[PDB]
Design an enzyme around this catalytic site. Structure first.
Site, PDB file in Angstrom:
ATOM      1  N   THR A  59     194.631  69.713  97.913  1.00  0.00           N
ATOM      2  CA  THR A  59     193.952  69.768  99.243  1.00  0.00           C
ATOM      3  C   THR A  59     192.638  68.996  99.241  1.00  0.00           C
ATOM      4  O   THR A  59     191.904  69.006  98.256  1.00  0.00           O
ATOM      5  CB  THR A  59     193.673  71.228  99.673  1.00  0.00           C
ATOM      6  OG1 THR A  59     194.913  71.912  99.887  1.00  0.00           O
ATOM      7  CG2 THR A  59     192.844  71.293 100.961  1.00  0.00           C
ATOM      8  N   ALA A  64     196.460  79.513 101.991  1.00  0.00           N
ATOM      9  CA  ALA A  64     196.875  78.989 103.290  1.00  0.00           C
ATOM     10  C   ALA A  64     197.030  80.098 104.331  1.00  0.00           C
ATOM     11  O   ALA A  64     196.609  79.941 105.477  1.00  0.00           O
ATOM     12  CB  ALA A  64     198.171  78.209 103.151  1.00  0.00           C
TER      13      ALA A  64
END
Ligand SMILES: [Mg+2]
Ligand SMILES: [Mg+2]
Ligand SMILES: [Mg+2]
Ligand SMILES: [Mg+2]
Lengths: 235, 240, 233, 212, 195, 231, 204, 244, 222
Positions: D1, D49
């Site tokens: 990420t 997430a």
């Protein structure tokens, strides 16, 4: 003395029937549902000229698509509004959508009879809940402290209710425009109000699909009052 | 626990316990609130039946809720302390979570909510107290003055009075207070507040308390001599 | 969380044309000790259901009491307790499955593998599995523990898919079950010769057979086997 | 990420990658790491997430309730602190969150708050979070100025994600751009890193090490 | 966080606190103020586990501000430090303790004296002429032991503080990005904007 | 008189006045009719409006795919009791993979209402319910009273002027029980039954509410132009 | 890691002829780091003296707790608490935290105001009372103190002789302990006068 | 059910008064008179024991004057048992404060705490209020010498001189007449005893019918001493002031 | 020690068309190296034109599906028989999953149906409730074998138009239901060949405006 949840010999709950008397003493609130929107109007009824009338909040937003007007012991309505707002927002969180007006109204009305010896007495306030959803379109509900709610094409609550309701009986039809409804609320409010109706002692609001719930400015309402006076003098 | 429904409706649609709480307010010493153009003044009556009092330590009638908001009241003194404490806690809690001090309207709405809660909760009676809440919102120069009462309703006022003989001083304020042109200075606002109390108070000695609140957390309580000068000037103009 | 103490081994079962067969041996093992030789691990519920249980015996006895209590409770205020509102295999299973999954979800499981065999009101065969994890599944043949590894392969040669069920008679099905029990006796170190067998048929009802034994065993060839490689004598 | 957000003259730029991995396995290339809290507030998603999605959607609900009760837009400070106070209650339970709460109000101007599952809450001008954060920081620090244009600022955020997407194995897929103004955020599209890399290489003359 | 220093001179207390905030691999900020004003004449600096530090500091701040309003009176530095110690002493036997170390620098308006209190996360309180938390003392205390005098001016205290920071910048492996310095005296709390 | 201040007090003749006052609330409520054959069970309800602007209060509530009821009296109490039925039906399905028997549903309602009549502080339910359903023993119709008394019937009616419909069903008993495999004719008998309880007003399109459940028919409610067929 | 030896420090108490003595070092540290040379470990409630070694936060907490409790005791009893009674109070208070104890080594010392009898007592962290006639020791140099006290002590010492014995017992014990020292205090207690003396010792 | 027997102790009258508070105040009016007088160099507490007996053990007896801590004392008027419940709670509050801040509790904070407890019994719980009125005599370094009073309503006020219990109307008039701001402790001692001697319902005021106390900075240097007078010491001060 | 989780194998596949959606899954159920059942339905019709499958640990999978079906039922009761839209169902499932954040349902959930504009929709969830609308999603044991094939054959990834040589991408033309079913069958046939836990049978649920239709296909049983 006697139980709070006691039935009378006629089969009615004393406390619920008594709370209805408190609502009769409340200031007038009127709702009119049309196919272009629902209009909500209220009598502010300031107890003194030194009271800043714009701080009187008897019309309230629940969500973008649901508005609410009150009549009676208005302090009691605050927790009902809080619950309604929470219910509307919570349902959006769980389901990624707007909540149906009826479902919101039903959630509010579930609180009503939660009293005994839960809260110590019923609510001393009636609510006109107006809104729009995709399933049933523009809707107006009357939420009582009995836990019962009726849907209405038009409804008046408060001190001038029976006189206003009789007037709404004659005036309402299924092809009313939003502008026609606005003037009609102003007309009937002016009729039942003790003091002379102006933009400071009365308030208008509406809910439309496009713009959502909106409380009207005093400048906007003032123009509608002036428009009303002229059309009544027109015949 | 004690769950008895004390606040209930009567056949005529009245909640007598809330109405009898208002009668306790009617008995309380007179309190008055007047907002000028750039200030708010809170006037309070001190009954002179109690002399030999220690005015240093005796609970003052006006209380700071935060550095920018004040609260005065009429009615039961013991009851008022509970509302003041809750308000002060909420004011700090608001600063802690929102990182901004309360607005005067917010603080009023909270106190009024507490009062309302006590009118439909089991095993409790309503507060025998009406409050006047005044101050200035953070980074705002518009004066704020609100009133609350036992039922839990609240509203904004250009000027207002509560307590005993409040009918008389409200009469005075209704004819003497102009909305189009409020007391432009601190002097004019205090003068009008003292004048309004002089309609009811008796002697203008230690019976009148005045507290001036200005923007940006500028709160000060006037002394006996400062107030006495207003009392002197008012009556000298009256002799005509 | 626990550990099983007194345990029961394989439960095996299969569907046939008119119903289901289920079997399990009468042993309650205590680790490698073959402690209890008279343990009934097939527990009938009414005249239409047989619950076969393996694993922890103390939990089996608890489950046995739940099922006994279920029959009592169903009869309360129920004029049709022995007719239209009698307990179905599907009701009994779903109840157990709920309990098993709830117990695993509290981290305090019933340390068992269960097979509910029966016949429904409409004559349909019911055969479904549930275990300590609350895992459920259905199949023409079902077996627990060692039975899964050794019995299923043999039983699946008779009924390999759904369409083989109407072609399979009760005599062929019972023969396959009895042979599977013999194979398990040869090869499972925690098994016994004595077992019980239950048939639930839509026509002839529940036939419960106790005190069965593994017979027709092959051991004679052992005499010729000598040493472990090179030894001749 | 890789997620970033920085304050500038024209408001706030928010830029994120789109890759989601479970070990070496690329689970998705089309993941949304900007949560649209409401039309005025944005949040970035790094770490867990679900934790980021769930609690920043929940934050939007709290922000909506605030402005219904107070009849006023919630401040970025207040909105960020609702989230940080919430995760702080859960501290120790194993929430995994690294986010930038971004907004532009009257009283504050453009404001960014880095909020953490350890309870950290930091106001700042430039933030970068994720496995490819160090790569994005380099491009940002060397090219950042307050007086950047909205066009150049958008490109800088895009180019910084590209830098991370290239080098960091757990970043890539596509770039999502947002521009936060006082009147609300404005979405500036999804940009595939595969197509963007070659485009940037040619036009900019960068990545000479790579053969194209 | 990392380095927090304190020194009580003749007529004031000086608190120096590092500006760096590091989250593992990267330095996320180089201008962080690790302090909260509890009252007009009482400042608290803090260092410890992330989140807990600010949560604790703001919780203390709110409580002292609440006391200030209720009584219309500022608590003495000693009284504030005792309150803070108790909270930490309560915290250490909790389900999840506050991992926070603090210095409380205050000017007692009644006694007309500066006062510095050092309190660790266990609730270990000590009043000192100069103090530190973590490894900060290991580098700086030998310099403070040598140069410190109780009759030092504020300017001399700042010079001795610069020498301590220079020694830290030389021998510490971590880059703490300099320090924010604040002075607490009879006139209140102010920040030295150039250091 | 002196023994009606709460539900916990017997009168000298052994009566519970609060329960009787709750029973009175049902008589004030609008009429609703229930009747069944061997294949189907039908609810017919006369809905009541506040005035001409208002909607007509809904009378029928669905509890499951195979069960539901009609109400007469305090509507909020019906919402509570119907919600409880929904949960019990749902518990039976989830836990036992079993549709709740209509008779057992009656037993549960009885016991829930009973607890409110023997304890201090509470109050009896102020509503009467007519539960219809189709289970493993065919079609069923129940009558619930907030005293706790639940009664399985071929047909019945509760509410204001319900005696007229109840007498009609008592005459028609031998006819409507035989209406098997014909939902429309069974509803006709129900609409004709409820018509015996009407005075001044007649059955209009937004006035009438009909519900049906049967062998191959899930519990479905008919309102609006869906009941114009039967007017 | 070990809570009873993070901060360090020692307390010793001795009986003499019509007198008791209690003494302590002044060190507070964070393991190797010396933090304070003014951390006194002896406290008094009326005429009853309490020394406390161990974890410093608990030393402070327990002092505040026993001040609290002896103040309420005095208000209700209308008299100051005695050493024998206070000893039982300390024991009770420690044992109520049986499965979450204060990490301390308390030492009570005083003279009973009515009988005039010298009294000392020691406790483990959990409340077990050690009521020795001769001496009580506590802290990170307790072994060293046991050795010093056992050889140096003799019964019925006069106040000014007892001072020398307890001082030398403390000092030389502290000098063989890394976590003790940095100054020392000695209380000489008689029925109606108490003398407090700060000792000069090595500051390493 | 139980509702039938509930007196409802926490309700307003139609006039807006709290029935039980008013009736508790009526109870207190029959209690022995207690007087507090604040001087520049100390405070005096004087109180009358109610119709005693010759067989009552006076030297060990305490019904009026109680010690809350070393700085603060109270004079009681009303139900003694009720007062002791509150007194013990006050003693604990003072100690809790001392433990927390390491400073003696300011007088007003203690007074506010006890007064808030009394208030609670008038607003919730359905219990009867405490039939007690306190005079608080105390000292702290903020406001110095302070006199307060609290009553069953939970309302408290500050005073230079005050009386509670019986004949407060007569007593307060006498105090208002002879009190001056520059007064000293020895003068206040005389005023207190003279006021009781005139307002008493007994034939004559004697040592065995009195409890007496002084809070003085007449302690060696900057500190405060509480003195609860012994029976012989009350007898001496009665002769000194010329009452017996 | 008691391990409350287990792995029942299986593989599922959801594909969103232009005006349709398919959710497929093998019918094999396993533990370790044993087959429990050759036909144990894994993809379920949940009503309101929504299909669902919760692949992984079958006990949690069954529990979740059961609770969601229950949620659909109560949505009808509470909101006047309103149809639960696929986006609303998706958000609801997030809360069901995140409800057990600290003791998760050990499954990878996929739902399929039509959005409120009538277009094909597939939503994909992780075990703790992070979700997303997707065009294409394989889940379970052979997911890593299937997804790259779908990237290539559905989205035409790495495919360019002949002659241009990398300059022009192959255009993303819409696939019919017959074309999707071919890719689904070939995905599972390939997965069956190379993954031991995949086989026995393939059950496909096709969702259109007309309703839910089922198709079954045999797979290799080794
Ligand atoms: Mg929060
Ligand atoms: Mg320390
Ligand atoms: Mg040493
Ligand atoms: Mg050393």
């Amino acid at each position: 003395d006697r139980g709070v949840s006691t039935f009378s010999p006629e089969g009615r709950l004393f406390q619920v029937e008594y709370s209805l008397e408190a609502i009769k003493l409340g200031s007038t609130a009127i709702g009119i549902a049309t196919k272009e929107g629902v209009v909500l109007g209220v009598e502010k009824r300031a107890t003194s000229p030194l009271l800043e009338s714009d701080s009187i909040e008897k019309i309230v937003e629940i969500d973008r698509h649901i508005g609410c007007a009150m009549s009676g012991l208005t302090a009691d309505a605050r927790s009902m509004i809080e619950h309604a707002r929470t219910a509307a927002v919570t349902h959006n969180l769980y389901y990624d959508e707007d909540i149906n007006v009826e479902s919101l109204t039903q959630s509010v009305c579930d609180l009503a009879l939660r009293f005994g010896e839960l809260m110590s007495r019923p609510f001393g306030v009636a609510l006109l809940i107006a809104g729009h959803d995709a399933d049933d379109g523009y809707q107006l509900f009357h939420a009582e402290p009995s836990g019962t709610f009726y849907r209405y094409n038009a409804k008046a609550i408060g001190s001038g209710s029976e006189g206003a309701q009789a007037e709404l009986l004659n005036e309402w039809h299924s092809s009313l425009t939003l502008k026609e409804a606005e003037l009609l609320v102003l007309k009937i409010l002016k009729q039942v109000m003790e003091e002379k109706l102006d933009e400071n002692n009365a308030q208008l609001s509406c809910i439309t699909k496009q713009d959502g719930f909106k409380i009207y400015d005093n400048e906007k309402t003032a123009e509608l009052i002036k428009e009303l006076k002229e059309k009544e003098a027109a015949e | 626990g004690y769950d008895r429904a004390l606040s209930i409706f009567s056949p005529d649609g009245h909640i007598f316990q809330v109405e009898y709480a208002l009668e306790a307010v009617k008995r309380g010493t007179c309190a008055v609130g007047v907002k000028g153009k750039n200030c708010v003044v809170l006037g309070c009556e001190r009954r002179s039946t109690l002399k030999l009092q220690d005015t240093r330590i005796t609970p003052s009638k006006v209380s700071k809720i935060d550095s920018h908001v004040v609260l005065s009241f009429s009615g039961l003194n013991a009851d008022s302390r509970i509302l003041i404490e809750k308000a002060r806690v909420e004011a700090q809690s608001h600063r802690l979570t929102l990182e901004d001090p309360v607005t005067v309207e917010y603080l009023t709405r909270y106190v009024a909510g507490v009062q309302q809660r006590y009118t439909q909760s089991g095993g409790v009676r309503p507060f025998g107290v009406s409050t006047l809440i005044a101050g200035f919102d953070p980074r705002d120069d518009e004066p704020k003055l609100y009133q609350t009462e036992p039922s839990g309703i609240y509203s904004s006022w250009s000027a207002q009075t509560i307590g005993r003989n409040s009918k008389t001083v409200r009469e005075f304020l209704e004819k003497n207070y102009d909305r189009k042109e409020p007391p432009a200075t601190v002097e004019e606002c205090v003068k009008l507040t003292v004048r309004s109390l002089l309609e009811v108070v008796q002697t203008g000695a230690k019976n009148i308390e005045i507290t001036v609140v200005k923007p940006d957390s500028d709160i000060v309580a006037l002394s006996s001599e400062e107030i006495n000068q207003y009392v002197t000037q008012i009556e000298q103009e009256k002799q005509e | 969380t626990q550990q099983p103490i007194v345990t029961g081994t394989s439960v095996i079962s299969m569907k046939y044309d008119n119903g289901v067969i289920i079997a399990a041996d009468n042993l309650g093992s205590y680790g490698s000790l073959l402690r209890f030789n008279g343990v009934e691990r097939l527990i009938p519920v009414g005249d239409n259901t047989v619950v076969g249980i393996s694993g922890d015996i103390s939990d089996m006895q608890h489950i046995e009491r739940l099922l006994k209590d279920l029959v009592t409770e169903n009869a309360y205020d129920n004029p049709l307790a022995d007719a239209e509102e009698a307990l179905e295999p599907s009701y009994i299973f779903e109840y157990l499955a709920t309990v098993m999954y709830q117990r695993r979800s509290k981290m305090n499981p019933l340390w068992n593998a269960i097979i509910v065999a029966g016949v429904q009101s409409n004559g349909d065969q019911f055969l479904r599995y549930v275990n300590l994890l609350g895992v459920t599944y259905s199949s023409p043949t079902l077996a627990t523990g060692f039975g899964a590894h050794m019995a299923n392969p043999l039983l699946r040669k008779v009924v390999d898919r759904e369409s083989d069920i109407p072609k399979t008679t009760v005599q062929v099905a019972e023969e396959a079950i009895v042979n599977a029990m013999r194979v398990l006796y040869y090869r499972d170190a925690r098994s016994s010769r004595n077992f019980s067998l239950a048939i639930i048929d839509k026509n002839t009802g529940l036939t419960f057979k106790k005190n069965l034994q593994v017979e027709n065993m092959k051991w004679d060839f052992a005499k010729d086997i000598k040493g472990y490689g090179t030894q001749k004598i | 990420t890789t997620t970033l957000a920085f304050r500038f003259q024209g408001g706030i730029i928010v830029a994120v990658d789109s890759r989601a991995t479970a070990g070496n396995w690329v689970a998705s290339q089309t993941v949304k790491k900007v949560i649209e809290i409401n039309p005025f507030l944005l949040g970035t998603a790094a770490g867990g997430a679900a934790d980021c999605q769930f609690w920043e959607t929940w934050l939007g609900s709290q922000c909506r309730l605030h402005e219904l009760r107070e009849k006023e837009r919630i401040s970025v400070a207040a909105a960020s602190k609702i989230l940080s106070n919430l995760v702080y209650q859960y501290k120790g339970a194993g929430l995994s969150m690294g986010t930038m709460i971004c907004g532009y109000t009257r009283k504050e101007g453009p404001t960014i708050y880095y909020v953490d599952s350890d309870g950290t809450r930091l106001k700042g001008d430039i933030f970068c979070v994720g496995s490819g954060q160090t790569f994005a920081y380099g491009v940002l620090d060397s090219n950042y100025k307050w007086d950047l244009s909205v066009e150049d600022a958008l490109y800088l955020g895009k180019r910084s994600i590209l830098a991370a997407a290239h080098r960091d194995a757990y970043s890539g897929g596509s770039v999502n751009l947002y521009h936060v103004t006082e009147d609300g955020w404005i979405y500036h599209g999804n940009h595939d890193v595969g197509e963007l890399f070659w485009k940037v290489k040619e036009e900019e003359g960068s990545f000479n090490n790579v053969i194209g | 966080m990392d380095i927090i220093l304190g020194i009580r001179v003749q007529d004031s207390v000086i608190l120096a606190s590092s500006k760096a905030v590091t989250r593992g691999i990267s330095v996320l900020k180089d201008s962080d103020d690790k302090t909260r004003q509890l009252s007009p004449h009482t400042l608290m600096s803090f260092a410890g586990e992330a989140g807990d530090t600010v949560q604790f500091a703001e919780y203390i701040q709110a409580n002292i501000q609440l006391y200030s309003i209720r009584e219309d009176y500022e608590l003495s530095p000693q009284a504030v430090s005792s309150f803070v110690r108790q909270e930490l002493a309560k915290s250490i036997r909790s389900r999840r303790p506050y991992q926070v170390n603090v210095l409380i620098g205050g000017y007692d308006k009644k006694k007309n004296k500066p006062e510095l209190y050092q309190i660790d996360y266990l609730g270990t309180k000590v009043e000192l002429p100069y103090g530190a938390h973590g490894y900060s003392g290991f580098y700086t205390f030998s310099l403070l032991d040598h140069h410190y005098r109780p009759d030092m001016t504020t300017e001399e205290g700042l010079d001795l503080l610069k020498l301590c920071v220079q020694e830290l910048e030389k021998r510490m492996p971590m880059d703490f990005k300099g320090v924010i310095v604040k002075i607490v005296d009879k006139d209140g709390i102010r920040q030295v904007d150039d250091f | 008189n002196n023994y009606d201040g709460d539900t916990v007090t017997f009168s000298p003749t052994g009566r519970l006045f609060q329960v009787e006052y709750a029973l009175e609330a049902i008589k004030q409520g609008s009429v609703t009719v229930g009747l069944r054959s061997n294949t189907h069970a039908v609810l017919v309800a006369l809905k009541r409006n506040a005035d001409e602007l208002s909607s007509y209060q809904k009378k029928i509530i669905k509890c499951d795919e195979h069960m539901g009821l009609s109400l007469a009296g305090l509507a909020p109490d019906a919402r509570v009791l119907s919600n409880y039925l929904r949960q019990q039906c749902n518990y039976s399905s989830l836990v036992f993979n079993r549709k709740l028997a209509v008779e057992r549903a009656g037993h549960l309602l009885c016991d829930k209402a009973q607890k409110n009549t023997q304890s201090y502080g509470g109050r009896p339910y102020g509503v009467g319910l007519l539960i219809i359903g189709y289970d493993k023993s065919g079609a069923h119709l129940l009558e619930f009273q907030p005293s706790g008394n639940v009664t399985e019937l071929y047909g019945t009616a509760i509410g204001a002027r319900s005696q007229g419909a109840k007498t009609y069903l008592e005459r028609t008993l031998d006819t409507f029980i035989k209406i098997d495999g014909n939902p429309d004719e069974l509803i006709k008998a129900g609409v004709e039954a409820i018509s015996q309880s009407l005075r001044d007003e007649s059955l209009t399109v937004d006035n009438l509410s009909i519900a049906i459940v049967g062998k191959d028919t899930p519990f479905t409610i008919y309102d609006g132009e869906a009941v114009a067929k039967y007017i | 890691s070990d809570p009873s030896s993070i901060n360090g420090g020692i307390v010793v108490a001795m009986t003499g002829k019509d007198c008791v003595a209690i003494a302590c070092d002044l060190r507070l540290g964070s393991q190797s780091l010396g933090v304070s040379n003014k951390f006194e470990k002896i406290f008094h409630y009326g005429h009853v003296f309490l020394g406390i070694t161990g974890l410093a936060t608990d030393v402070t907490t327990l002092n505040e707790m026993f001040r609290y409790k002896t103040n309420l005791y005095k208000l209700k009893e209308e008299r100051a608490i005695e050493p024998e009674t206070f000893t039982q109070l300390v024991s009770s208070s420690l044992y109520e935290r049986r499965f979450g104890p204060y990490f301390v080594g308390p030492v009570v010392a005083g003279i009973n105001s009515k009988s005039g009898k010298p009294f000392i007592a020691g406790f483990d962290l959990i409340g077990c009372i050690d009521e020795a006639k001769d001496f009580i020791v506590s802290g990170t140099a307790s072994d060293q103190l046991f050795g010093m006290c056992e050889s140096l002590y003799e019964p019925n010492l006069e106040p000014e002789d007892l001072f020398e014995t307890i001082s030398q017992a403390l000092l030389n014990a502290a000098d063989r302990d890394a976590l003790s020292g940095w100054g020392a205090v000695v209380y000489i207690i008689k029925k109606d006068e108490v003398v407090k003396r700060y000792l000069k010792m090595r500051q390493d | 059910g139980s509702r039938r027997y509930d007196s409802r102790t926490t309700i307003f009258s139609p006039e807006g008064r709290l029935y039980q508070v008013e009736y508790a105040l009526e109870s207190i009016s029959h209690a022995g008179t207690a007087i507090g007088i604040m001087a520049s160099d100390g405070i005096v507490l004087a109180a009358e024991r109610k119709v005693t007996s010759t067989l009552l053990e006076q030297d060990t007896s305490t019904e009026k004057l109680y010690k809350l801590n070393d700085k603060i004392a109270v004079a009681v008027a009303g139900l003694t048992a009720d007062a002791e419940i509150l007194i013990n709670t006050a003693r604990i509050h003072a100690q809790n404060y001392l433990k927390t801040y390491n400073e003696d509790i300011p007088v007003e904070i203690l007074v506010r705490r006890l007064s808030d407890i009394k208030q609670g019994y008038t607003q919730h719980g359905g219990l009867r209020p405490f039939g007690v009125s306190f005079i608080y005599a105390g000292y702290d370094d903020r406001y110095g010498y302070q006199l307060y009073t609290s009553n069953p309503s939970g309302n408290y006020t500050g005073w230079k001189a005050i009386s509670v219990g019986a004949n407060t109307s007569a007593a307060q008039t006498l105090l208002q007449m002879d009190y001056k701001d520059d007064m000293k402790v020895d003068d206040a001692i005389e005023l207190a005893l003279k006021t009781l001697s005139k307002t008493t319902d007994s034939s004559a005021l004697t040592y065995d019918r009195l409890e007496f106390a002084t809070i003085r900075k007449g302690a060696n240097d900057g500190e405060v001493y509480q003195k609860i007078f012994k029976p012989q010491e009350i007898k001496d001060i009665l002769v000194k002031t010329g009452i017996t | 020690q008691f391990n409350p989780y287990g792995d029942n194998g299986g593989t599922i596949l959801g594909i969103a068309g232009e005006d349709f959606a398919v959710l497929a899954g093998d019918t094999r159920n396993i533990t370790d190296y044993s087959i429990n059942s050759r036909y144990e339905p894994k993809v379920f019709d949940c009503g309101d034109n929504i299909v669902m499958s919760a692949n992984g640990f079958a006990a949690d999978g069954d529990a979740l599906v059961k609770r969601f079906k229950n949620s659909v039922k109560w949505y009808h009761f509470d909101h006047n028989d309103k149809k639960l839209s696929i986006n609303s169902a998706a958000r609801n499932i997030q809360h069901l999953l995140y409800g057990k954040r600290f003791f998760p349902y050990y499954v990878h959930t996929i739902i399929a149906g039509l959005d409120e504009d009538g277009k094909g929709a597939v939503y994909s969830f992780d075990p703790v409730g992070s979700y997303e609308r997707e065009q294409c999603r394989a889940g379970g044991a052979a997911a890593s074998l299937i997804m790259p094939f779908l990237d290539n054959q559905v989205n035409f990834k790495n495919q360019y138009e002949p002659g241009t040589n990398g300059k022009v991408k192959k255009p993303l033309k819409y696939l019919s239901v017959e074309e999707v079913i071919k890719l689904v069958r070939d995905s599972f046939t390939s997965a069956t060949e190379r993954h031991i836990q995949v086989g026995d049978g393939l059950e496909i649920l096709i969702v259109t405006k007309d309703g839910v239709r089922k198709e079954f296909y045999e797979l290799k049983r080794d």
